[PDB]
Design a protein around this nucleic acid. Sequence first.
RNA 1: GGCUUUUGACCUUUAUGAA
RNA 2: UUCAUAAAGGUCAAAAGCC
Length: 343
Amino acid sequence: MDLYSTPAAALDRFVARKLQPRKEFVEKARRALGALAAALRERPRVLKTVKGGSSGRGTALKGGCDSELVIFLDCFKSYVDQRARRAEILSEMRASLESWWQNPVPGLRLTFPEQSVPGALQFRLTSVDLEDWMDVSLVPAFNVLGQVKPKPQVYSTLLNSGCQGGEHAACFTELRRNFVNIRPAKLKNLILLVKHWYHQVCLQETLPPVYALELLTIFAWEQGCKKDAFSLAEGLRTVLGLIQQHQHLCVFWTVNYGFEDPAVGQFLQRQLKRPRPVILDPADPTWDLGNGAAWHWDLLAQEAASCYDHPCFLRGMGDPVQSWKGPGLPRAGCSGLGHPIQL
RNA sequence: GGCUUUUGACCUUUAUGAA
RNA sequence: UUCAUAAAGGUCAAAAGCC
């Protein structure tokens, strides 16, 4: 990798030069999605349109990224309605996209992949370059959050819906975006670095969603660093060390839900007993981004384990950078991590 | 020392949709 | 009164690049 060959001391320059998105493309994309939101709301009433995905979370990389545009509709009054009103809503959105694109944003080509995701209309905006692109997922959702920690009823009702894990993740996009986007700038730079490492591994399927590594990075920094200023190499080394320990990973946050409601609390306990890694979306307790052996964490671990023999993990005269230390992080004597740290 | 960029929070406006 | 997206201006904070 170019990442590997970059000395640890030059990592901030690598992030700035290779990983941070192109300002020009970001703006063109922003006004495009702004105009699409405009066309959708101007015509089921649109209550609210919020931005999620890597772009909305603040974790988009240069040269290819994803975005989610969540369209909250007043025709949904229960979670199960999104599943019920799915084909017909998405049908209307396709017509809206056609209308919208009759006034195209000048620097972008509109294309469509195969529709992989039920409950979403996916399309791509690519630059003329063609050095940058955004895979957009347009997702109708029920506005359970209204207009702040959610009342526990928000999540007990979710459980009563009988939904699949993360099936209604879009409903909580505002919370998810706030969790990741409202963070010290350098932490977000580290996230970009981690995601870039992940992307290069992928190029060289069925791996964990990228969002899983965003959470793991936030976990690493919260347990081992917590400062606005720190070194990227050590953070990266810490994250890769956690990945090697995937069988011991059990990570969650109580920012949006907790144990105080018996129903929600009892579900949280069950989620935490699932095959590791378990990494619960802080916005949606039903969405496990670890998910046991479902995803090939082993392949990520295999690459992590052998990649330390590189300039990006070396300072001075070949002194290996050290993983951060702290409550949730690899310990010298211990084989486990003591996860979940809260329990 | 100089130069430029990114990201938040907050304040003052504006458009649109909504409660 | 509030919420959302987009835009204009301002204050503050953190990080980063080059010389």
